[PDB]
Amino acid sequence: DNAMPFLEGPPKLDGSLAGDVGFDPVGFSNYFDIRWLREAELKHGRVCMLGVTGLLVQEAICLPQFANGKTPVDDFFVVPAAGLWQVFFTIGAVEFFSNGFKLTPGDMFSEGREAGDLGFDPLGCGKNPDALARRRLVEVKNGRLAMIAFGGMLHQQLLTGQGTLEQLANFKAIN
Amino acid sequence: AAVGFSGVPSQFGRPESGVYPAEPSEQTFLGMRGPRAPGHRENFGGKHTATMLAIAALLWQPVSEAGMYRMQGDGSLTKTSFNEFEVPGFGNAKKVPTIESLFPFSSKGFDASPVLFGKNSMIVVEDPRDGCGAYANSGSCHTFLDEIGDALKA
Amino acid sequence: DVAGLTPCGESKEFARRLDGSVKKLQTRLKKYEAGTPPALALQKQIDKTKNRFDRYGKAGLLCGTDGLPHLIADGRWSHSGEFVIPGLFFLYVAGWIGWVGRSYVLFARTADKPTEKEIIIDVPVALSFVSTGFIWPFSAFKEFTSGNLIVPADEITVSPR
Amino acid sequence: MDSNFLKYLSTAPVLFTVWLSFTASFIIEANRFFPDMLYFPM
Amino acid sequence: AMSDSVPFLKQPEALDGSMAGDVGFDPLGFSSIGDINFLREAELKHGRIAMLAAAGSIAQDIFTFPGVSKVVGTAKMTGVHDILVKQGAMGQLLLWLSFLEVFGTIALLETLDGKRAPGDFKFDPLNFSKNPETFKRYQLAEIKNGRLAMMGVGGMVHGYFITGKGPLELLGNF
Amino acid sequence: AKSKAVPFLSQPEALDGSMAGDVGFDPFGFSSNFDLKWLREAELKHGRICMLAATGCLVQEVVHLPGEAFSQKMALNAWAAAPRGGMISILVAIGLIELISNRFALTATDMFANPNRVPGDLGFDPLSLGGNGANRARMELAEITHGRAAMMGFSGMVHQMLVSKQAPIEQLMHFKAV
Amino acid sequence: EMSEAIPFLPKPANIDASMPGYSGFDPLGFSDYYNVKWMQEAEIKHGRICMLAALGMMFPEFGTLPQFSSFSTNPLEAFYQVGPAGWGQILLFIGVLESFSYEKVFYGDSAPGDLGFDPLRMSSNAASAKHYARAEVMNGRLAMIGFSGMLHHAILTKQGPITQIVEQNFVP
Amino acid sequence: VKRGSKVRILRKESYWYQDIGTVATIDTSGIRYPVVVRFEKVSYSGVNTNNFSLDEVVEV
Amino acid sequence: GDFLIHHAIALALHTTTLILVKGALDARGSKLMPDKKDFGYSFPCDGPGRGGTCDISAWDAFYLSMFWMLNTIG
Ligand code: CLA
Ligand code: CLA
Ligand code: CLA
Ligand code: KC2
Ligand SMILES: CC1=C(C#C/C(C)=C/C=C/C(C)=C/C=C/C=C(C)/C=C/C=C(\C)C#CC2=C(C)C[C@@H](O)CC2(C)C)C(C)(C)C[C@H](O)C1
Ligand SMILES: CC1=C(C#C/C(C)=C/C=C/C(C)=C/C=C/C=C(C)/C=C/C=C(\C)C#CC2=C(C)C[C@@H](O)CC2(C)C)C(C)(C)C[C@H](O)C1
Ligand SMILES: CC1=C(C#C\C(C)=C/C=C/C(C)=C/C=C/C=C(C)/C=C/C=C(\C)C#CC2=C(C)C[C@@H](O)CC2(C)C)C(C)(C)C[C@H](O)C1
Ligand SMILES: CC1=C(C#C/C(C)=C/C=C/C(C)=C/C=C/C=C(C)/C=C/C=C(C)/C=C/C2=C(C)CCCC2(C)C)C(C)(C)C[C@H](O)C1
Ligand code: SF4
């Protein structure tokens, strides 16, 4: 079916990709390559899944090497700067090596590579095709859900100044 | 042979162009009629322009009310500028450019709102008729009709 | 300030020039009755002298030891209105004038008898040309880059060397 | 307007005199209403 | 070839009778200037917003939600607007109505292309108009009630500007 | 053979009722010495500027932007009281609108070089309100009549503001004879 | 055939799409008079110098070399605080860099901008080479505009770009 | 060169050197300068035509 | 005054240079007289023909430039 019944189905969304319900009202797929859009969507969603898990874990668990802030967003501002640069450059090395040093929309998919498939499947998990399709669908939906969830958790922790589970209990309202 | 202000360069001995494109009838909402590349009015016609204007007006609403809103003990909110947002890891540049750098409403004393007229930036409307009438006024109201009437009645 | 000169608004000899001019006009004013048209004309001249000296003293002009404003023309922006900006105004007008004249010459070659156009101006066409001069730098530069302003040396007459 | 009279009016000396008087009138009225402009005011 | 509503005026050429509420009423020829699809979308949007505003004025006269009386006090009708601009309610209202109106803009431009009826968002989650004739009856009723509520809400807010009573309070006090 | 507007003069040549607002009114023979396309483009430009200008001279009294600098009801005071950088931005933007809207053909020798370029047709129809054929001639007639009325009205308002030192509406409400 | 940057003008004759930073933009017709390959080499060099300059107008506000830690964060003061010896060494290094450019431009027939500095071989992949070839000219033009802006703003404000932003000193 | 053609003059001493004239007559007899060329600009002596050899005229 | 008199001096030097350089470079021939080198450095004229040729030699350019040299040293 179509997500928006009062508009026609976007012609570049053919339903082959997992998660396609026909939702492109602005028409982003009419201008940009769909492989770049899928790589960006999966990367944003994966970063948000790790961010949701980190925001839930850094509220309660703090390694003794670091010194926890009152909220997981303030936890960024108490880390040494060299450590943040270390994480940033390690992520840059991963981004360089996982893409074959091909980091731009003009050469990322020049060798016919699949969007979001960087060949990282260590623990088996990828032999059944019928399970591969369903796990693709689960990955894209949980990625979008973790995008919206991470946006909510970060903005409400910035607003209230307390953590997420610290806000689920003793819940206050704007007054 | 050469009419004044004719605007034909060959009539004035001016270097001509030769190539004159035909004028298409396709129209864009915020653009102009004229010769364009093939594919141009189909990607960037009225639909695209209206969609981008809608998206810009939508995104204006968080941008106009830009700031760090912090809850206090009584549940009230204190809004403070992004200019005090400090970063740990760019050396001696603790203060950094933010979204309020691109949209500095408070620098000009402009009370921005999500529809861009604020409480302290309201459009000022005042009635110029001063609470009197068109004719037969006795007071601080001498209209043009009263001047005409006094000119006849003298 | 610049070059050891003093601003005119604090120079005592500038004030001495103003006072000398005012007394020189006032001694002429003394010989006429109040209300007579020469008296009004002289008082208007006094008013213009006072207004001119007041305006010159508040403009940041530099005065020498003579008592007259001295212009600075080394390119500094603090006196950029003394030579640079009026000159550009001339540069606006003069580049206009030659261009429209050049345009008329290029028109005049295309007529049946050019010399009659040279002595008897085609007034609508000339008014069109003098209207065209408002964008003269860009038009002249495009005329230059398209090879329509500069002609090669092999098409120009020269004397035997 | 007779076309021969207009063509005589379009001659170089008449148009020269009229244009230079017109320019002089611009300079004269500019200096009458805005006198003593030694400088471009800042 | 004459207007049915105004018998001494011609039938407007952009009007045909297909749309609900068409009685040939366009004396000033506004449909000759604008597109009839844009005009019908504007009429439906003005009417639906005015129905919601009329029903809101009636119900806010009738009763109030829990807790609104503390923040607002004895301020009613358009007088709450500025207060609820200082509070966060109307910023949320504008944010979500702008989010809806982005897709409304895309739908209006799609209608101006000509693949979609004006005001047809296909929003019938209760499936009221199964057979086409009841669909026509609700279309006529919707456009008539929308125009009636446009006039009603105009009267209500200008009567509030005159007396400061409210549409039911003005009925209950001369 | 005679002009309709001025019945004691002969009909001016090149005027044949084709353009909107053509009543044969050209006593000084401007169309006999200059081309009608440039004259029509200039007339429409002066008229449109005066439409915006008359609407501004009436609206600015009733409605102002917030701020002290925009609180002058009389428009000749609002010319000076408005911030200078904003008006220089207005000048530059008008220059850019002239530059791109005429498609780099700005003079009396290159505007209308394209045979498809029509006097007053810059291609400006943002809401496409001209998509109707039999309305078109009446629309151009209404536009030129509004422009002419606005030119005469805006001239009268500016010089009456000069005489009276009063904004127009309150000058009509607080009238003082000369 | 019409220009793609200015759709109502004809396409300029002496620029073609094979040049990396082509957009069909020559309203003044510079390519019609001057040597196009010279103009390409000059654009590339102006853009590269402005890339280094746009990074270096901003970078000392983040941090300075320990020997230059006492130097001002305003670039127009730190230009003067450097002695003639350091600027002479910088000029000598720039001259060493320009000797290769002199030889290539006045005596060679290489591609525009090609001084033979490709140690990482990042232009080996054809699509990657095309993307980098266009992107160098784009970021060079952007840095030309940005460095022009930063220099005249530093003239007006006597502080660096980040410093001028965070104090919000936007009016002269 | 032929009748009616526009030609440029390569005679160094000529008033119309590197200027354009129109060929008025080409004489067929054994004349040293058989090409009569008429010019739109008059010389210092007021003449506007001159005879040239074949090598002193080049077609434009 | 020093500014004005040095720019007047520059005017006089440039004008004397104009006369002298124009005399030296047109000494071999001009459009009015392309065979001037056949007539030597000094001769009165080339007659009233071709519009008139008074003071056409380079010696005459010396003669005209002497007054400007006297003006410049003055
Ligand atoms: C080759 C492997 C390697 C080695 C030897 C180190 C060594 C170090 N790391 Mg480290 N790191 C690595 C890989 C490595 N890292 C990777 C792959 C990651 C990402 C998962 C990290 C993430 C990381 C974080 C998040 C932090 C460190 C920190 C540290 C420092 C701890 C001691 C300290 O604080 O005193 C040194 C104290 C100083 C003030 C000196 C400044 C730090 C120097 C300049 C860093 C030098 C690191 C060195 C170049 C190796 C980096 C490898 C690179 C690929 C990341 C030490 C220099 C901590 C740190 O630097 O705290 C300050 C810290 O917070 N690292
Ligand atoms: C169409 C106008 C025009 C143009 C564009 C030029 C262009 C030029 N002249 Mg020339 N000139 C002209 C008219 C013109 N001339 C006339 C009428 C005279 C006789 C007085 C001269 C006498 C003259 C001399 C003696 C010299 C030049 C020189 C020059 C060159 C340098 C610029 C200069 O010194 O200007 C200065 C111009 C003048 C002093 C005279 C200008 C006279 C008026 C103001 C211009 C005519 C405007 C015209 C009436 C407009 C009518 C058009 C209208 C119908 C639309 C340049 C090639 C100089 C040179 O060789 O430099 C390389 C030089 O030494 N010219
Ligand atoms: C000839 C046109 C014109 C000009 C030169 C001015 C000039 C001015 N107006 Mg103004 N104004 C105009 C028309 C004009 N107005 C019209 C038509 C309206 C009614 C909507 C207004 C309403 C208005 C208000 C409410 C205020 C001013 C104010 C001002 C002053 C400050 C500038 C400012 O903030 O602009 C503000 C300008 C606007 C709010 C609207 C301008 C709309 C113009 C006409 C643009 C539309 C056409 C545009 C060129 C696009 C066409 C392109 C096409 C040709 C291709 C300044 C003296 C302010 C002031 O000083 O108060 C006294 C102020 O508060 N104006
Ligand atoms: C992420 C990219 C992007 C954004 C965010 C964005 C936003 C907005 C907004 C937002 C408020 C408006 C109002 C607006 C309007 C117009 N845009 Mg759009 N635009 C983007 C991309 C492009 C490109 C690549 C082109 C283009 C164009 C036009 C034209 C054409 C006029 C005409 O054709 O006459 C108009 C009117 C085409 C053009 O001609 O640009 C000169 C063109 O090539 N746009 N655009
Ligand atoms: C369609 C959609 C849904 C829907 C939902 C929608 C919201 C259903 C509701 C539609 C409602 C909002 C209709 C409201 C109409 C207002 C009437 C015409 C006006 C009164 C104004 C006049 C008489 C007056 C006034 C007067 C004057 C001026 C001032 C006063 O002093 C006095 C007075 C008051 C007499 C549903 C759930 C149905 C399901 C469907 O599947 C999908
Ligand atoms: C083209 C079209 C566009 C449209 C558009 C534009 C914006 C059209 C709207 C235009 C406005 C600007 C027309 C202005 C008229 C002003 C004059 C008539 C007032 C004259 C009063 C004078 C005569 C009188 C006066 C008097 C003076 C003398 C003395 C005083 O004591 C009194 C008084 C003041 C009474 C849109 C945007 C829709 C898009 C579409 O796709 C295409
Ligand atoms: C050669 C290549 C490699 C190399 C690498 C080298 C190091 C290449 C480095 C290239 C670097 C220098 C690129 C830098 C670009 C910066 C530009 C785009 C920006 C200016 C910003 C503007 C927009 C602005 C600003 C604005 C100013 C005006 C005003 C403010 O109010 C606002 C704001 C701040 C927005 C190596 C050596 C590895 C080898 C390899 O084999 C090949
Ligand atoms: C929120 C807010 C505010 C506000 C506001 C609001 C909510 C404003 C709302 C205004 C509205 C809804 C006005 C409606 C006007 C209707 C008219 C004139 C109808 C005329 C009909 C006629 C002439 C004829 C009808 C006819 C009849 C009789 C029968 C035949 C047909 C026809 C000929 C058509 C403010 C401004 C106070 C500011 C405050 O800080 C915040
Ligand atoms: S008047 Fe002239 S041409 Fe005649 S003889 Fe004397 S110098 Fe020669």
Any atom of ligand 6 within 6 Å of the Cβ of F53: no
CA dihedral over C16, C18, C19, C21, signed as positive or negative: positive
Q: State how far the Cα of C70 lies from the Cα of C79, in Å rounded to an integer.
A: 10
Q: State how far the Cα of E85 lies from the Cα of E72, in Å rounded to an integer.
A: 11
Any atom of ligand 6 within 6 Å of the Cβ of F55: yes
- Rounded to the nearest angstrom, the minimum Cα separation between E91 and chain B is 7
CA-closest residue to ligand 1 atom 50: A86
Which residues, other chains included, contact B106 with Cβ-Cβ below 8 Å and sequence gap of 6+?
B81, B100
C109: tokens are: 């070659």
Please choose, from the candidates E125, E147, E126, the residue with its C-alpha nearest in 3D space to the C-alpha of residue E48: E147
Helix orientation angle between F136-164 and F36-62, rounded to the nearest 10 degrees: 60
Q: Enumerate long-range contacts of B79-85, CB under 8 Å, 24 or more apart.
A: B81/B106, B83/G166, B83/G168
Answer yes or no: are the C-beta atoms of H25 and H1 closer than 8 Å. no
> Ligand 1: which residues within 6 Å by Cβ?
A 80, 82-83, 86-87, 89-90
Which residue in this structure is represented by tokens 């308002």?
F157
CA-closest residue to ligand 2 atom 47: C101
Q: State how far the Cα of B147 lies from the Cα of F173, in Å rounded to an integer.
A: 10
Buried/exposed E120-152: b ≥16 CB within 10 Å, e otherwise: ebeeeeeeeeeeeeeeeeebeebbebbbebbeb
Q: State how far the Cα of G76 lies from the Cα of G60, in Å rounded to an integer.
A: 12
Radius of gyration of chain B (CA): 30
Q: State how far the Cα of G59 lies from the Cα of G65, in Å rounded to an integer.
A: 11
Please choose, from the candidates A86, A106, A84, the residue with its C-alpha nearest in 3D space to the C-alpha of residue A94: A86
CB count, 10 Å around CB of B143? 19
F107: tokens are: 């003079």
Radius of gyration of chain D (CA): 16
> Ligand 2: which residues within 6 Å by Cβ?
C 97-98, 100-102, 104, 121, 126, 129-130
Q: State how far the Cα of C41 lies from the Cα of C21, in Å rounded to an integer.
A: 15
Which residue in this structure is represented by tokens 């536009």?
F143
Q: Does G122 touch chain B (CB under 8 A)?
A: no
G31: tokens are: 């390519």
Q: State how far the Cα of B9 lies from the Cα of F111, in Å rounded to an integer.
A: 9
Answer yes or no: are the C-beta atoms of E54 and E133 closer than 8 Å. no
Q: Residue G117: how many CA atoms within 13 Å on its side-chain side?
A: 7
Q: Does E102 touch chain B (CB under 8 A)?
A: yes
Q: By what method was this entry solved?
A: cryo-EM
Helix (DSSP H) and strand (DSSP E) numbers for chain B = 4, 3
Inter-CA distances, F105 with B8, F97, F108, F113, Å: 11, 12, 9, 8
Q: Does I4 touch chain C (CB under 8 A)?
A: no
CB count, 10 Å around CB of F78? 19
Please choose, from the candidates A117, A144, A113, the residue with its C-alpha nearest in 3D space to the C-alpha of residue A132: A117
H24: tokens are: 């008025």
Helix orientation angle between I2-25 and I58-73, rounded to the nearest 10 degrees: 170
Q: State how far the Cα of A173 lies from the Cα of E67, in Å rounded to an integer.
A: 12
Please choose, from the candidates F152, F160, F151, the residue with its C-alpha nearest in 3D space to the C-alpha of residue F49: F151
Question: Separation of F52 CA from ligand 3 center, angstroms?
Answer: 8
Q: Pairing relation of β-strands H49-52 and F63-64?
A: unpaired
Answer yes or no: are the C-beta atoms of E79 and E95 closer than 8 Å. no
Which residues, other chains included, contact G61 with Cβ-Cβ below 8 Å and sequence gap of 6+?
B91, B92, B93, G73, G160, G161, G162, G163
Q: State how far the Cα of E108 lies from the Cα of E120, in Å rounded to an integer.
A: 10
Please choose, from the candidates B14, B34, B15, the residue with its C-alpha nearest in 3D space to the C-alpha of residue B24: B34
Provide the 8-state DSSP code for F8.
T
A145: tokens are: 């859900």
Helical segments of D1-42, H only: 3-9, 12-33
Answer yes or no: are the C-beta atoms of A35 and E150 closer than 8 Å. no
**Residues 1 through 60 of chain H touching chain I, CB cutoff 8 Å:** 12-13, 15, 43-45
Q: Does C110 touch chain B (CB under 8 A)?
A: yes
Please choose, from the candidates A41, A46, A48, A49, the residue with its C-alpha nearest in 3D space to the C-alpha of residue A23: A41
Consecutive H or E run containing F39: helix F36-62
Chain D residue with minimal CA distance to C116? D11
Fill in the amino acid letter for G125: N
Q: State how far the Cα of E165 lies from the Cα of E157, in Å rounded to an integer.
A: 10
Q: HEC profile for chain I? A: CHHHHHHHHHHHHHHHHHHHHHHHHCCCCCCCCCCHHHCCCCCCCCCCCCCCCCCCCHHHHHHHHHHHHHHHHC
**Residues 146 through 165 of chain A touching chain B, CB cutoff 8 Å:** 158-161
Q: Which residues pair with B4 in a beta bridge?
A: F34
Q: Does C124 touch chain G (CB under 8 A)?
A: no
Helix orientation angle between E36-62 and E89-113, rounded to the nearest 10 degrees: 160
Which residues, other chains included, contact G38 with Cβ-Cβ below 8 Å and sequence gap of 6+?
G105
Question: Helix (H, G, I), strand (E, B), or coil: what is residue A76?
Answer: helix
Radius of gyration of chain F (CA): 20
Contact G27 F103 (CB under 8 A): no
Q: State how far the Cα of C97 lies from the Cα of C107, in Å rounded to an integer.
A: 15
CB count, 10 Å around CB of A153? 22
Q: State how far the Cα of E18 lies from the Cα of E2, in Å rounded to an integer.
A: 16
Answer yes or no: are the C-beta atoms of B35 and F125 closer than 8 Å. no
Inter-CA distances, F29 with F4, F14, F25, Å: 15, 10, 9
Question: Helix (H, G, I), strand (E, B), or coil: what is residue A162?
Answer: coil
Q: What angle do CA F62, F68, F74 make, to 5 degrees?
A: 40
DSSP state string for F91-127: HHHHHHHHHHHTTT--STTTTT-STT--TT--S--TT
Question: Separation of E16 CA from ligand 5 center, angstroms?
Answer: 28
DSSP state string for G39-64: HHHHHHHHHHHHHHHHHHHHHHHH--
Q: Pairing relation of β-strands H49-52 and H57-59?
A: unpaired
Which residues, other chains included, contact G78 with Cβ-Cβ below 8 Å and sequence gap of 6+?
G60, G68, G71, G72
Question: Which atom belonging to ligand 9 lies closest to the Cα atom of I53?
Answer: 3
A107: tokens are: 């050469």
Consecutive H or E run containing E70: helix E68-72
Answer yes or no: are the C-beta atoms of F122 and B32 closer than 8 Å. yes
Q: Give the dihedral of Cα atoms B34, B35, B39, B45; nearest 10 deg.
A: 0
DSSP state string for chain C: -GGG-EETTS-HHHHHHHHHHHHHHHHHHTTS-TTSHHHHHHHHHHHHHHHHHHHHHTTT-EE-TTSSEE---SS-GGGTTTTHHHHHHHHHHHHHHHHHHHHHHHHHTTSSSHHHHHHB--HHHHHHHHHHGGGHHHHHHHHHHTTSSSPPGGGS-----
- B-F Cβ pairs (cutoff 8 Å, strict): 113
Q: Pairing relation of β-strands H49-52 and H35-38?
A: antiparallel
DSSP state string for chain G: -B-SSSTTSBPPTT--TTSTT--S--TT-HHHHS-HHHHHHHHHHHHHHHHHHHHHHHHHHH---GGGTTS-SSHHHHHHHS-HHHHHHHHHHHHHHHHHHHHHHHH----TT-SS--SS-TTSSHHHHHHHHHHHHHHHHHHHHHHHHHHHHHHHHSS-HHHHHHTT----
Which residue in this structure is represented by tokens 């607080």?
F174
Of H8, H13, H19, the CB nearest to C160: H13
A7: tokens are: 């508009």
Q: Using CB atoms within 10 Å of the CB of residue F106, give its burial: 0 to 12 exposed, 13 to 18 middle, 19+ buried.
A: middle
Answer yes or no: are the C-beta atoms of C118 and C151 closer than 8 Å. no
Answer yes or no: are the C-beta atoms of E143 and E47 closer than 8 Å. yes
Inter-CA distances, B39 with A31, B36, H18, I35, Å: 11, 8, 52, 69
Question: Helix (H, G, I), strand (E, B), or coil: what is residue H37?
Answer: strand
Question: Helix (H, G, I), strand (E, B), or coil: what is residue A173?
Answer: coil
Q: State how far the Cα of I56 lies from the Cα of I47, in Å rounded to an integer.
A: 10
E64: tokens are: 């109030």
Please choose, from the candidates C142, B16, B18, C135, the residue with its C-alpha nearest in 3D space to the C-alpha of residue G30: C142
Consecutive H or E run containing E99: helix E89-113
CB count, 10 Å around CB of A7? 21
Answer yes or no: are the C-beta atoms of A51 and A157 closer than 8 Å. no
Q: HEC profile for E1-65? A: CECCCCCCCECCCCCCCCCCCCCCCCCCCHHHCCCHHHHHHHHHHHHHHHHHHHHHHHHHHHCCC
C139: tokens are: 């038009």
Please choose, from the candidates E12, E5, E20, E8, the residue with its C-alpha nearest in 3D space to the C-alpha of residue E119: E20
Which residue in this structure is represented by tokens 């080409």?
H26
The pair phi, psi for residue C120, each rounded to 5°, is -115, 105
Q: Enumerate long-range contacts of C82-86, CB under 8 Å, 24 or more apart.
A: C82/D39, C82/D40, C85/D40, C86/D39, C86/D40
Q: State how far the Cα of E155 lies from the Cα of B139, in Å rounded to an integer.
A: 34
Answer yes or no: are the C-beta atoms of B46 and B28 closer than 8 Å. yes
